[model samples]
Target: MVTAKKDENFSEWYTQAIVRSEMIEYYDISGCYIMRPWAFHIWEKVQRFFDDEIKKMGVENSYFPMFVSRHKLEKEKEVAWVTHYGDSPLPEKIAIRPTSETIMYPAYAKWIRSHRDLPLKLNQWCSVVRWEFKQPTPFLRTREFLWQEGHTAHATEEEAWELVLDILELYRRWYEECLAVPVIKGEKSEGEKFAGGKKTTTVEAFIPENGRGIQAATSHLLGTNFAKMFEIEFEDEEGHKRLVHQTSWGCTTRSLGVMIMTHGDDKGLVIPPRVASVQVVIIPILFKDENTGEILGKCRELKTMLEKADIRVRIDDRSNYTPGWKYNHWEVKGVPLRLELGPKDLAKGTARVVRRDTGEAYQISWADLAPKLLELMEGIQRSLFEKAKARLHEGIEKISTFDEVMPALNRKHLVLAPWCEDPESEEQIKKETQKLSEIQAIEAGAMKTLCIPFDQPPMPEGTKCFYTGKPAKRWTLWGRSY
Candidate 1:
């Protein structure tokens, strides 16, 4: 049972909701997790979308060794080290990848020699280790987690820039269409960008529960920085050698946490229909003196029909448990649709339908089971997205000055203040906000510029940054983040 209330105790509620739903199990390692079938299936759904889409873009799947040379490392200090073979120490440290650029780019350096060999796109589905020194959260920030990292070397900077946005858009669609989570597409601030990369494009996901932002996925244009480091070069049309324009983009398992936090209610998780492994679960209502065989047979028959329509359906007919218990079991499991078949309903050729997203119950005819549930799916997906979007919308407050920042944050909202994109002011904003967070008793953490959103609203004349007191440039989304 999920004991914590999400609105009252979000962290505990998420921990309970995730574990009780059978999505994951805590591992003995502090930041490690066991991905259960429930969670893996969802990951597979996301993987299917991204893999198929990238393949069409001429990206081929490849695997790189998980470990990298310590000297070849380009990521941050937060990394796990493999210093020894068994107990005996090796001559040099072998480091597990915090990200794949260090491992994959070396291969890119060897493969490309001419313009003909340019645009070498390789993607690998791999687990990465980042020994983050922060509170560990399941699926969100862990020591080791699954992600799809794509590394591409392009002949032209224009081509590289185009592909960067191409990958970012795919990430947006994955969050919206597949996960039923609304996200804002934006470019990372200079201070927040991927180190060594020119610009980092991202999909920013908002958690309404605590008014926090989660960087859902990122697409970075490295602009030959990694190429220069790795010596990835190609001969151009004029026969002049040039460094290849490079890009690296990825999405991670943290999306699972965002989806759960966005849609789950007090009862349990409210899984979106698109990614749910089991779209519908049928529970047969039984009685000792009734036509038990007929009831179960109807459940089986309806399941076949639903499955024929390509809907994932399951029949829960274990005689040991009561129908009410079965409903709770599947509800906690977050199946999008529940069908309760009883003597009265079977007699009338109908099944009691309950929608997990809305908790709306209605009698759906047995004949309409497949098409009805199938038709209901899109509406459910839309409903979940719209509801989530509403919460995201509610959590945003637009302001023009620094004084309003904490007030907005204290109300569980992130600010859309006019920003000059000043580097000094960005850090200064966090410094003050950290003090404000402590004085105000908001544990949501210090605020930073989440992103300079791509969707720009025309700035009013004479607008200025809250901290720098300079001419405002663009609207930036600011919040404490995961």
Candidate 2:
């Protein structure tokens, strides 16, 4: 029935929204679920947009092996990447990559040899397995998920860093424009940045339902770290050998979870128009058996019209189901617009329209239906982004002391506070707030630094660290995250 109220029980509501809408289906394995067509179609749209856009920047699509040798996996020098799997007649120690950096760079070292081959840009659309020990939470926290990783090497530090932000901006627009979710663009602190990365830039999105922030995507400057380790060097134009500067960035199915959390409602999912699989569904209202053929013909004609306008549409013409039933079905499925055609609409040369986001209804004359639907789709997309933007604006609170942090988070707000930028102190603060959250019975686990925002507010003279009492180094966003 998918009747759980979103505000009352978000966990249940999300599970129901994904399952009832057929976006995902539970499998026998824990932390792994099947991506149903409803969700995969949205992923396709995301892939199409990113693949098309990255190609414009001269990035070429390629594939790399999924397995990594133990030595190469250990070459990264920090952190256990993933579990090692052994199969019959295979290598004695083969690690299923949690990421492609290890497996790809060795060949990158071999393939690149000259300055002319410099700035080798490659990307791959693939899936990775992390073998998460924690309870899986669908797309947000899964053992296996899909993503596209863009790996590039440049001749100069300036070029490498530029591509870092360039890819980051693409991720930002991808979220805001396609998913209609607003994100806070910022830089990760030393403690929070990716291991083996010199600097990490990210687009972070928040969920108003739980007052938590989730990283939408990340771009990292490797700064010759992997190049030096893997010996991915090239002859410079000056005839000297030099290590290549590298960058890797990716966004995953987690964005789908973010979209669901941000825009879904008690009724069910509310997909933004831009990412909707079925942008419009036409359900012919047939009360009398005699009028069914005429009404359905009109519905098909309208469907043809919308499809000619490049709208993704479907016609629900099953005589076995009632119109009310179809309405609920598509509503849960989050079709952006629903069209109703019956006998009256046939005579009047009009169709009834329903907006999924607001549930607003109106009548559109068939003479201008396609253009009008396009305009309404744009409106729905814009409206979803505005609502999320407003929530993001209202959820941030500026504070000056450690004591204020837990209270702010307890009230479901993210705190903007100054910090000493000490990794040790950041860990200490996380532990301290984690205990405080436990004592207060809040479920967000612990407060950690989300990012040191690039858009820094002017620091007042003599600012002190919120927890350490040292001179403040920067303003950072700290919150519980998924």
Candidate 3:
């Protein structure tokens, strides 16, 4: 049974939510786990939706090898671009294939020779390894995980920028529309942006329960660095050779991690209706009576009708499990809607439909099942997103002073604090918060500059940096993130 209370113990609750839901299986390796069908099915939904969307943008899917030469990995001058704090669990200095730049761009240099070959976009659905030594959470900070890496080359920086923003939009939709999670679209702070990326744009989401922000995905403007380093040049309209601008972006299986963390409850994983592989489960309330055949017949009939409508439908007919037992099983599995049929329900000409998002139950006439179920499922998806969005809206606290930052964070709200955008101030605040949080929770993370969101609120005249007391430049989103 998934008995852990979510609010009482989030870490244990998450471990149970994932394991008891049958979505993950512990593996022999420390930082890796088996992606049970329950979990991979969700990842496939994300991939299908995102793959279709990216294809509509004229992006093509291709494969790049995972292996890379030590010299090729060394081409990028600095891992310092991993950012100054080095709070990231995966140590950047290791020559692991954290990103495919060293392997993919060299091929781009060969395929692109002229302006005609410009705008060459390729996306690879693959896994990258990072021998992370951090206390690994199965999907969030694993040594290896599945993801899609997109690398594109353009004749001009303007064209590259268009794709960068476009990809970030797709990622935002993947979170909001598919996963039923709300995210803020923003650019990374200079101290937090990606290594070797000219500018990094991200979709940042938070777990209200933990009061920590998690970066959902990122799209980077590589500029000409990789192209220049790899000698990826193309002849311009004027017949002069010029370096092509490039962009590389990825959204990982960590998508599943954050989605689970944000939505799972004490009962178990609350899979969004939109992304649940098994959206509706039909359970038979069996009895040792003559009407049992009729009850089971009606269950099969309902499954056929829903199948015609293209709903992911299934029936629980295992004789070993009783009705109450099966209810617990599917509830743990997070099926969005459950339909229970029995002799009583058959006689009444109605079926009992129970919603997973809210344990609300109601009866609908068998004649209206498909249409009503679709409506309810649509309602479930929208309601889930709204619930999460409300949390996010309520969880962000705007503060005017440094004193309020840590308290706000400790209370599980991301702080929107005035800042000068200096690394020194950012460093000072992290150390100060780290000292305070260590007293609170020995392993609790310090606040990180998640991003300086592009959406700016009105800055009142002469607002000062919370830490430095200097003139404020912008409002930055500060939080404790994993």
For all candidates, what are the clash counts? 0, 0, 0
Better-scoring candidate (lDDT), 1 or 2: 2
Q: Over 4 Å off in model 3, which ranges?
A: 78-96, 440-444
User: How many backbone clashes are present in model 1?
Assistant: 0
* Best-to-worst TM-score order: 1, 2, 3
Candidate 3 clashes between residue pairs 3 or more apart in a chain or in different chains: none
- Best of the candidates, lDDT: 2
Q: What are the runs in model 2 whose C-alpha is more than 4 Å off?
A: 78-91, 442-444
- The lDDT per prediction is 0.89, 0.90, 0.87
Span of ten consecutive residues with least summed lDDT in model 3: 77-86
Stronger candidate by TM-score (2 vs 3):
2
The C-alpha TM-scores of every prediction are 0.97, 0.96, 0.94
Per-residue lDDT for 1-482 in model 1, tens only?
67899889998899888889999998788889999999999999999999999999999999999888877884322978888778899898888888888888777888898899978988999899989877798988988999999999898899999999999999999999999999999989999999999999999999888888999999999998888888989898788889999999999999998999988998889899999999889888878889999999888899888888999988888989998888888888889999899899977988898999888988888778778888898889999999889988889998888889888988879889889997888898888899888877755469998988999888889999866889999999999888
lDDT tens digits, residue span 218-298, model 2: 999999998989999999778898999999999999999999988999889999999998999998887865677778878
Q: Positional deviation of 318 in candidate 1, in angstroms? A: 0.7
Best by TM-score: 1
